[PDB]
Design a protein around this nucleic acid. Structure first.
Ligand SMILES: [Ca+2]
Ligand SMILES: [Ca+2]
Ligand code: NA
Lengths: 246, 243
DNA sequence: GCCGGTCGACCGGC
DNA sequence: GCCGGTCGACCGGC
């Protein structure tokens, strides 16, 4: 992680900070801005990242060509836009943001990538652990890590930003965590909720003590297990209760 | 539908005015200017139903005000929020709310939900309403035998950024309970949500509401079964080889 | 404490 | 044409 080193300054900086008001999504703008002010050469929005990468090789055109530019089936898988969209990319037609992009920020250096996703959170309101990342996307991710044996390329990390309403919104606190540093098997997969791993960064454990490859293998086990179970529970929850009306 | 008659009226004005989109607010206005009398935001309606009965208090009691195991289900905000309600502590908008707009007149409820559709970006049908919520609804409907109480209608609002702002391009209007059930797409991963564009929605169903519920339920059961099988093939067969 | 449903609308593979 | 996964968080029942 490139950002733990200065997490305290981030912490201190953000705590206090305020934003306008019509959820606290725009708090991420500040993270990016701050990160942009103390890690300039490592910080990109994910679209911003693709852009630079496609600008650096203006001759490489066409999506299959541009895809080769990643040098990593896995990173290829997490950061890249679609074929047509890769096809039609151009200096006059840059990538813009996209709800469904994996990361909110990339910190990259010496060909190591940190994918930062910023979970905002209204602590005054209830406490509903939010979507973290797709369980299925995380699974395909692991398969690739083994299949290409890319176990020392990137990490997925989270920066919670707590805030509350005050006349203006203001961050009262923040947490930070590392995905690949948590227990694969304790991860809560919410299937209906777009199959999203769900937790509060605050409460995420970091006691994991094995290799990255092991982690992938343990996650894939958890996933498959929960997948089998879910298939079964659907009969109970979704069929059984309604057979009677037929 | 208290909308269908004046659909022409609505449509006409909608096209050409500007403002994720949120013309949802726009339309409300029209319906308020022209129907201020049976036009509520869902939550607004609730303050009204609660303001108009200052005697009844606590939740157990306040739900009787719905006089409907079904509307209750679809409209209620739930024990604690309801218990804690009072004129100095009114409901606000809740992301979770079933409806965007509510037209109720002579004890018939029209549950309206607009769908904004960036018509320039993609043809990605949006979530229309959780299929499982709907199941529960149909079940209640059946049970409590209340087929002539409420409609769930949609009104699409297309748009593009042809200018400094967005801009409505055109609209559409369908009725969930006029569609063929067995035909509705249930995207399980997407919050178990029925997905469609209003413009493409079949409106050719000619049975009883009782029939519609019975058919929709069969469709749900069938589709819940295939999804469970889909999971094995999609999220189990392909990864077993890594363990 | 524990658990999992809902709104919102969004591409892109073949 | 046919399909369906993804980000965003967010509530209440026992
Ligand atoms: Ca985020
Ligand atoms: Ca809506
Ligand atoms: Na809906």
């Amino acid at each position: 992680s490139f950002i733990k080193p200065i997490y305290q300054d981030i912490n201190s900086i953000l705590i206090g900070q305020k934003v306008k008001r019509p959820a606290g999504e725009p708090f991420e703008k500040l993270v990016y801005k701050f990160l942009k002010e103390n890690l300039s050469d490592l910080t990109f929005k994910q679209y911003e990242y693709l852009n630079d990468l496609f600008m650096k090789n203006p001759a490489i055109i066409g999506h299959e060509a541009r895809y080769k530019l990643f040098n990593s089936p896995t990173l290829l898988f997490l950061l890249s836009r679609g074929k047509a969209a890769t096809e039609n990319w151009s200096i006059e037609n840059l990538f813009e943001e996209k709800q469904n992009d994996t990361a909110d920020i990339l910190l990259v250096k010496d060909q190591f990538y940190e994918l930062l996703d910023v979970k905002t959170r209204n602590i005054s309101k209830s406490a509903f652990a939010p979507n973290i990342i797709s369980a299925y996307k995380l699974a395909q991710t692991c398969a690739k890590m083994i299949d290409n044996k890319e176990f020392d390329l990137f990490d997925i990390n989270y920066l919670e930003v707590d805030w509350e309403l005050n006349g203006d919104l203001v961050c009262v606190s923040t947490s930070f965590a590392e995905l690949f540093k948590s227990e694969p098997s304790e991860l809560y997969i919410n299937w209906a909720a777009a199959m999203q791993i769900q937790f509060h960064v605050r409460d995420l454990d970091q006691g994991f003590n094995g290799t990255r490859e092991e982690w992938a293998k343990s996650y894939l086990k958890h996933f498959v297990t929960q997948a089998e179970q879910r298939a079964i529970s659907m009969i109970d929850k979704f069929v059984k209760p309604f057979k009677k009306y037929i």
